[PDB]
Amino acid sequence: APSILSTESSIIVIGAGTWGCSTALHLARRGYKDVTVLDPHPVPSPIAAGNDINKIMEHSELKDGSSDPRSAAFSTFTRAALKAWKTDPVFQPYFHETGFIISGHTPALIDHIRKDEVEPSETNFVKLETAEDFRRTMPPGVLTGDFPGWKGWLHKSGAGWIHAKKAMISAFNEAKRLGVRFVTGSPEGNVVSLVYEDGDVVGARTADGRVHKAHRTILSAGAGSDSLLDFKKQLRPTAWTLCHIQMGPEEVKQYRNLPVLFNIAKGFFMEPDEDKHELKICDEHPGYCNFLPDPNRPGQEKSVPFAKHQIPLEAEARARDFLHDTMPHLADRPLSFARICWDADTPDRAFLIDRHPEHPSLLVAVGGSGNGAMQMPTIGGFIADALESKLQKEVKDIVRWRPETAVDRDWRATQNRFGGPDRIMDFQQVGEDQWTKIGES
């Protein structure tokens, strides 16, 4: 069916985000001379989930008998990612191997962590039983709370945080230096449709009415991808919430080299950024969707993203609850920034990276499922491998096109997340006056 693939083949990548920039870089390194990346926004896109001052990176090797094929595939992805965060000149400056603490504050949450995360892992964890145990994982003055009911485990090596925003910019800069062409801005990079001829994809149409033709088209537009192809319910666009506190110029100096602290039913925080000294808190919960009528499925819903630099008041309150337990000296500080951030979950929260069975010139690379950002250095290599029909066996069948898994999908499934109301929430039920008002009157 499709044209024969070579490095002279014209390629279009839809979406210059986390995975799109990685893909552009890897295709350039592999000697693909004719690559064009389309995005409605210039890098770093304000709607990219990767456009964040930090994200968590973690890699765990799994014991024999404690893996299933899905978790083994995940460890294959993170193994490669870890190696590259420590080595690849484009990414290495942006990885901080400070460690990672996973915790919960009820016996049920703590048991879940023990069974799913700790017992299966070859990692040698340090157990944290008391408030003092938690506080001693960071410099004096940083963790001050009583951690009521908390127990957790510290993973020192092979985990930490990444400066996702700077690493994405780094990848973009290097892909463009190596000759990739970026068309970024609206309407010129805002893709509204895939373009088909003879039952295959021949490129993309942007909002200005231009048709961009290529021999292969890669769809890597994060949550926005769901509007450009019928994924047969394989994607659920879903939002999480983040806010920032501005640290002062003396107090900030203690907050350095910090392991990530994560309570699976409350949230996490990462150390203040180097440029604005802003400390980011994510309140953990199963996610917000924005459920509107599915234009192609009568009587059914489909979640549609929208951008906003505020968060619901209830999400701010959850963030402050996390701070009260951990850093109560910060819990009443004004927010300096907040936003909603969109990803898309597959039914099993494995990635979806495959050639389309009906349209072989289309490659989809979607379904970050809440753990795509840590894949940045290497995900473009896996995506390029799939383009070249050689995605490795340890991942190919896990991340395949799999519409059978999403028949009668329950959009309100909590998909192994916890916190907040312990249910999927709907932005259509959030009042207009129910948001933070940062920077307003």
Ligand SMILES: Cc1cc2nc3c(=O)[nH]c(=O)nc-3n(C[C@H](O)[C@H](O)[C@H](O)COP(=O)(O)OP(=O)(O)OC[C@H]3O[C@@H](n4cnc5c(N)ncnc54)[C@H](O)[C@@H]3O)c2cc1C
């Ligand atoms: C709050 C939050 C915290 C997270 N924490 C972590 C973490 O700690 N570690 C981790 O690994 N992952 C984390 N994730 C998940 C991670 O951010 C995502 O899985 C990953 O960034 C997704 O990458 P992507 O390239 O698929 O999407 P994105 O990075 O969102 O990029 C998508 C791009 O597509 C572009 N686009 C959209 N519409 C179109 C269109 N019509 N035409 C062309 N281009 C388009 C966008 O402008 C954007 O640049 C988190 C996500 C959220 C929301």
